[PDB]
Amino acid sequence: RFLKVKNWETDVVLTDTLHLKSTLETGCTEHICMGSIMLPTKDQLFPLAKEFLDQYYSSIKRFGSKAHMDRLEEVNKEIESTSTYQLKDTELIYGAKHAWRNASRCVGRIQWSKLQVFDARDCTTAHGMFNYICNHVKYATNKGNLRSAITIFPQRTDGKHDFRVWNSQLIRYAGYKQPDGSTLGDPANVQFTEICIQQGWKAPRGRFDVLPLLLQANGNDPELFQIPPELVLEVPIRHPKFDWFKDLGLKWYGLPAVSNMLLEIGGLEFSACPFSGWYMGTEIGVRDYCDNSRYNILEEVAKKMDLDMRKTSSLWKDQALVEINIAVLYSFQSDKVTIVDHHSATESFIKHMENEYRCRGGCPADWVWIVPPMSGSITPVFHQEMLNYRLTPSFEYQPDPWNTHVW
Amino acid sequence: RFLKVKNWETDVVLTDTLHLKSTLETGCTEHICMGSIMLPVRTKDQLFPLAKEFLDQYYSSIKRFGSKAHMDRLEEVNKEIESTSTYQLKDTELIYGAKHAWRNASRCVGRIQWSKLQVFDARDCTTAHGMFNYICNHVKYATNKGNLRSAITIFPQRTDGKHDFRVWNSQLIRYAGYKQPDGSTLGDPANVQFTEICIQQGWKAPRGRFDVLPLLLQANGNDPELFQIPPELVLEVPIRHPKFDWFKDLGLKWYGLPAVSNMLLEIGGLEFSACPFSGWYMGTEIGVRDYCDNSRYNILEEVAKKMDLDMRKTSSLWKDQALVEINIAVLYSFQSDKVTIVDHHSATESFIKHMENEYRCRGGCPADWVWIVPPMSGSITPVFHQEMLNYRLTPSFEYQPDPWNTHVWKG
Ligand code: HEM
Ligand code: HEM
Numbered sequence: 001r002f003l004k005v006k007n008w009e010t011d012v013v014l015t016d017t018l019h020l021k022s023t024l025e026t027g028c029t030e031h032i033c034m035g036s037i038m039l040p041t042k043d044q045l046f047p048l049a050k051e052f053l054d055q056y057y058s059s060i061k062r063f064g065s066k067a068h069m070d071r072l073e074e075v076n077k078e079i080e081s082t083s084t085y086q087l088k089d090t091e092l093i094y095g096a097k098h099a100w101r102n103a104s105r106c107v108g109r110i111q112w113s114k115l116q117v118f119d120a121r122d123c124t125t126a127h128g129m130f131n132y133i134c135n136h137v138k139y140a141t142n143k144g145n146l147r148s149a150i151t152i153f154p155q156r157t158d159g160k161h162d163f164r165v166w167n168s169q170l171i172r173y174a175g176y177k178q179p180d181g182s183t184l185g186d187p188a189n190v191q192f193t194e195i196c197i198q199q200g201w202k203a204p205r206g207r208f209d210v211l212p213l214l215l216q217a218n219g220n221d222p223e224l225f226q227i228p229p230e231l232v233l234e235v236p237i238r239h240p241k242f243d244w245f246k247d248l249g250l251k252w253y254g255l256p257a258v259s260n261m262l263l264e265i266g267g268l269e270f271s272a273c274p275f276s277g278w279y280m281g282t283e284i285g286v287r288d289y290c291d292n293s294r295y296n297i298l299e300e301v302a303k304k305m306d307l308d309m310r311k312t313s314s315l316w317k318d319q320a321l322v323e324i325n326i327a328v329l330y331s332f333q334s335d336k337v338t339i340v341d342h343h344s345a346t347e348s349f350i351k352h353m354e355n356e357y358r359c360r361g362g363c364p365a366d367w368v369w370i371v372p373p374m375s376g377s378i379t380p381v382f383h384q385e386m387l388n389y390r391l392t393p394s395f396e397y398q399p400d401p402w403n404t405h406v407w
Numbered sequence: 408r409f410l411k412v413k414n415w416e417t418d419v420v421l422t423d424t425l426h427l428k429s430t431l432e433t434g435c436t437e438h439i440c441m442g443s444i445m446l447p448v449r450t451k452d453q454l455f456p457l458a459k460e461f462l463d464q465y466y467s468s469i470k471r472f473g474s475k476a477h478m479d480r481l482e483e484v485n486k487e488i489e490s491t492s493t494y495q496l497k498d499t500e501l502i503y504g505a506k507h508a509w510r511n512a513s514r515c516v517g518r519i520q521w522s523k524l525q526v527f528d529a530r531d532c533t534t535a536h537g538m539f540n541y542i543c544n545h546v547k548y549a550t551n552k553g554n555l556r557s558a559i560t561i562f563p564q565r566t567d568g569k570h571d572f573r574v575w576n577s578q579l580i581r582y583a584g585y586k587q588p589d590g591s592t593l594g595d596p597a598n599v600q601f602t603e604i605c606i607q608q609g610w611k612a613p614r615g616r617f618d619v620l621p622l623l624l625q626a627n628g629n630d631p632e633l634f635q636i637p638p639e640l641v642l643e644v645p646i647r648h649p650k651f652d653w654f655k656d657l658g659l660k661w662y663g664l665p666a667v668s669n670m671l672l673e674i675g676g677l678e679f680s681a682c683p684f685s686g687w688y689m690g691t692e693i694g695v696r697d698y699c700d701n702s703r704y705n706i707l708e709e710v711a712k713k714m715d716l717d718m719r720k721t722s723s724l725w726k727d728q729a730l731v732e733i734n735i736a737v738l739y740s741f742q743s744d745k746v747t748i749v750d751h752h753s754a755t756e757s758f759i760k761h762m763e764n765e766y767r768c769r770g771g772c773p774a775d776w777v778w779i780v781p782p783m784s785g786s787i788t789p790v791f792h793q794e795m796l797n798y799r800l801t802p803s804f805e806y807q808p809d810p811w812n813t814h815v816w817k818g
C-alpha cells in the first residue's frame with residue numbers, strides 16, 4: 001500500500017502514496033501487464049464533482065470551510081436541477097493545470113504550474129473557435145519565445161453538441177498518396193488531408209503544406225480555415241558542420257499543439273481543449289523525421305554522409321540519427337525558437353519527480369513514454385523506476401470525430 | 408479470452424491466447440502498472456499440481472498426451488513425491504524444461520535461439536571442486552574459440568533449502584571493482600561488493616581495471632570456495648575502432664562469453680538455484696550499458712574528449728555522438744576477432760520474426776518492452792513500435808536473493 005521506487009544509477013529511493021488516490025483503471029491485471037499498449041448521468045456526476053471540489057478546496061487550504069460546504073451544496077444543487085454544472089474560473093484553471101500535472105506520459109511536467117488558461121466557454125461558432133485558436137497560436141508562439149497555453153471550449157452536454165478540433169495538432173503538414181505508391185509529405189496525416197480535400201481545401205500538394213483547421217462547434221458540421229501564415233512559425237533545418245544538410249529541404253514548425261484530446265475535470269468533459277508547450281528535439285529529429293511510417297529520411301541522410309549502408313552493424317542508421325538530431329536542435333536555437341534537448345528535459349523530469357514525491361507523495365509516470373526514443377540509457381529516466389496510475393483531472397484520448405459525427 | 412497487440416509501424420495485429428495459461432503474478436493491478444519496477448521450501452501439497460502441469464505440458468509437446476507413458480509418469484512422480492517429498496526429472500524433461508524457461512523469458516530479446524541450447528546435466532555434482540570442473544567445461548564448450556554456442560549447466564535442485572548449490576558470481580566471467588580510499592572506483596563498479604567478498608575469502612587481487620574475478624562456488628549448502636578460471640579458457644577482445652586509431656589507447660577490452668549465474672531455474676515446481684547459462688552478446692550490452700552507464704565504466708567523457716566534441720552544452724549531442732562511436736568499435740572488434748556478437752538492429756528484427764512465429768504456433772510470446780527495446784536508438788528498431796504483453800509462464804528463470812545475504816556460515 002506504500003510503494004517504493006528506486007533509481008538504479010543513484011540508489012535514491014522514493015515512497016509513493018499518491019497512487020491510493022487513483023481512480024481510473026490501467027489496463028493491467030495481476031496476470032498481465034499492458035504497459036506497452038498505446039490505448040488500453042446525474043448519479044455518476046455528483047461523486048466526481050465532489051471528489052474534484054474536495055481536492056480543489058484542500059489545495060487552497062480551505063478544506064471543510066463554510067465556503068467549501070457551500071460550493072459542494074451549490075454544485076449538487078445545479079446537478080440535481082440541470083444535470084450538469086459550471087466550473088468557476090478558479091476551478092477551471094486548477095483543473096487544467098492538474099490535468100497536465102497528472103499526465104503520466106509527459107516528460108515536461110516540471111512546467112505544469114505555468115500554463116496560461118484561455119477560457120473559451122462562451123464560444124458558439126466555428127468562426128469563434130478559429131479566432132480563439134489564432135489568439136492561442138500567437139500568444140503561445142510569442143515570436144519564438146514559447147509559452148505553454150490551453151484554450152478550453154464549452155463542455156459536453158447531451159453529446160450531440162460536441163465542440164471538436166478535427167486536426168490532431170493545430171499545426172501539422174499534409175500527407176498525400178501518390179500514383180507512384182509512395183507518400184508525399186507526412187504519411188501520418190493522409191486520412192485527415194483527404195477529409196480536408198473532400199471538404200473543399202485546395203491542397204498545394206507539397207512536402208510541407210500546413211494543414212487547414214477543421215473546426216466543429218456545437219455538434220455542427222466542421223468548417224475549414226487557414227491559419228494566417230504569419231502566425232505559423234517554421235524553422236528551416238540546417239547542420240552546424242554539414243553545408244549540404246540544407247539541400248534536403250527539411251523544415252518543421254515551432255509550435256506543438258495537441259488538439260484531439262479530452263480534458264476531464266470534476267466529471268465534466270471538454271472535448272475541444274487544444275494545448276501547447278514546446279518541443280523536445282527527439283520528437284522531430286527521431287520520430288517525425290526517422291520513423292519508417294513518417295518522413296523516413298534516414299536512407300537519404302546516410303547517403304549524403306557516405307556511410308557504409310551494406311551492413312546494419314556499421315551503425316549507419318545510428319550515426320545519421322545523431323546528426324539529424326544535432327541539426328534540429330541547432331536550427332531551432334539559431335532561430336531563437338524554444339526547444340529542449342532530451343538530456344536537459346529528462347534531467348528536469350527527475351528533479352520534478354523528486355519535487356512531486358516530496359510535496360505530493362508521488363508522480364504517475366509511464367516509463368515507456370518518458371524514456372526518449374534515442375540514447376535511452378544515457379538519460380537518467382532510463383534508470384528511474386516509475387509507477388503508472390491514472391489520476392483526475394486528466395487528458396484522455398477520444399475517438400476521431402469523423403468515425404462518430406453524423407453529417 | 409483473446410488479447411490483441413498492434414505494431415504501429417506495420418499495422419500487423421496479433422492475437423494472444425497463451426496468456427490464459429499464465430499462473431504467476433506480475434506486480435501490476437487494475438489501479439497500478441509496475442512495468443518499470445526492476446524486481447516487482449515447498450510442501451508435498453503444492454508440489455504435485457506443479458509437477459502435473461509441467462508433465463502435461465511436456466507430454467503434449469511430444470504428442471503423447473494421455474498416453475500410457477504419460478499416465479505412468481504422473482503416477483510414478485506422484486508416488487515419488489508422497490514417499491520422498493520431491494521428485495527427479497528425467498533427462499528429457501530437464502532438457503525440455505531448460506529450453507522452455509528460456510522460451511518463456513519475457514526480458515530476453517535473443518529468444519529466436521531458444522530451441523538450440525546445449526544442456527549439461529550436473530545433478531550428480533557434490534562438491535565445489537566438482538562445480539568448478541563442470542563450469543570450466545561449460546565455458547570451453549560455449550566459447551568454442553569465438554564461435555559461441557548457447558549452453559546451460561544445471562546443478563542439483565533445492566531440497567530443504569539448507570543444502571543449496573549456488574554460484575555466488577552474478578556472471579561466470581566478470582571484472583573486479585575496487586573502491587579506493589579517495590572514493591574513486593578502479594575496474595567495474597557493479598562488482599565492488601562481490602570483489603570485497605572474494606578478497607575476504609582469500610583472493611589475491613591484481614587490482615587493475617579488467618581483472619577476471621575468481622569463481623566463488625557453494626555446493627550442498629557448504630561455505631563457498633574460490634577457484635580461478637584457467638585464463639586460456641577466458642576469451643577476451645581488445646576494443647579498437649575502424650577509423651579512430653586512438654581508440655585502442657583507451658586500453659579497453661571485454662570478455663566474449665556472457666554467462667548469467669545468479670538466477671534460479673524453476674521446472675515443475677523443482678528449484679535449480681545454480682544453473683549458469685550463456686548465449687552471446689548484443690553489442691549495446693557492452694558499448695551502451697557496461698561502458699557508458701554513469702555507474703559502470705563511465706567512458707563517455709574521455710571518448711568525447713578524444714573526439715574533440717563540443718562538450719560545453721548537452722545540446723551538441725556529444726554524449727550521443729560518442730555513444731555511437733563506442734558501439735561501432737565494440738561490433739568492429741568482435742567481428743574482426745571472429746567472436747560472435749549481434750548488433751541491436753539484427754537482434755530486434757530477428758526478435759519480431761520470432762515473436763510473430765510464436766503467436767502463430769504457440770498463441771503468444773510474453774515480452775517485457777522495457778527490457779526488449781535497446782538502450783540506444785530505441786525507435787529506429789522495430790521493437791519500439793511493437794505492442795507486447797508481459798505475463799509469467801513456467802518453466803522459468805527467476806531472481807533470487809544474493810547468497811551472502813542468506814547463507815548460514817559454517818566456518
Ligand atoms: C512545455 C514543454 C513540454 C514538453 C517539453 C513536453 C514534452 C512531451 C513529450 C516529449 C511527450 C511525448 C509526446 C510524443 O511522444 O508524442 C509529451 C506527451 C504529453 N504531454 Fe507534454 N510537453 C510539454 C508541455 C505540455 C503541456 C503544456 C501539456 C498540457 C497542458 C502537456 C500534456 C501532455 C500529454 C497529455 C501527453 C501525452 C499525450 C499522448 O498520450 O499522446 N504537455 N509531452
Ligand atoms: C543467444 C544469444 C542471446 C542474446 C543475444 C540474448 C540477449 C539478451 C539481452 C540483451 C538481455 C537483456 C540483458 C541485460 O540488459 O542485462 C537478455 C536477458 C535475458 N536472457 Fe537472453 N540472450 C541470449 C541467450 C540467452 C540464453 C541462452 C538464455 C537462457 C538459456 C537467456 C535468458 C535470458 C534471461 C532469463 C534474461 C533476463 C535477465 C534478467 O532479468 O536480468 N538468454 N538476453
Ligand SMILES: C[C@H](O)[C@H](O)[C@H]1CNc2nc(N)[nH]c(=O)c2N1
Pocket residue numbers: 035036037038368369370415791792793794795
Ligand atoms: C508500442 C509502444 O507502446 C509505442 O511504440 C510507444 C512507445 N513509446 C512511445 N513514447 C513516446 N514518447 N511516444 C510514442 O509515440 C511512443 N510509442
Ligand SMILES: C[C@H](O)[C@H](O)[C@H]1CNc2nc(N)[nH]c(=O)c2N1
Pocket residue numbers: 008382383384385386442443444445777778779
Ligand atoms: C528502472 C528500469 O526498469 C531499469 O533501468 C531497466 C530498464 N530497461 C532495461 N533493459 C535491459 N535490457 N536491461 C536493463 O538493465 C534495464 N534496466
Ligand SMILES: CS(=O)(=O)C/C(N)=N\CCC[C@H](N)C(=O)O
Pocket residue numbers: 256257258275276277278279280283284287288
Ligand atoms: C504538443 S505539446 O503539448 O507541446 C507536448 C509535446 N511537446 N509533444 C506532444 C506531441 C507532439 C508530437 N510528438 C510531434 O512531434 O509533433
Ligand SMILES: CS(=O)(=O)C/C(N)=N\CCC[C@H](N)C(=O)O
Pocket residue numbers: 517665666667684685686687688689692693696697
Ligand atoms: C548472458 S546471456 O545469457 O548470454 C544473455 C545476454 N546476452 N545478456 C545477459 C547479461 C549480460 C550483461 N548485460 C552484460 O553486459 O555483461
Ligand SMILES: [Zn+2]
Pocket residue numbers: 028029032033034035435436439440441442
Ligand atoms: Zn503493467
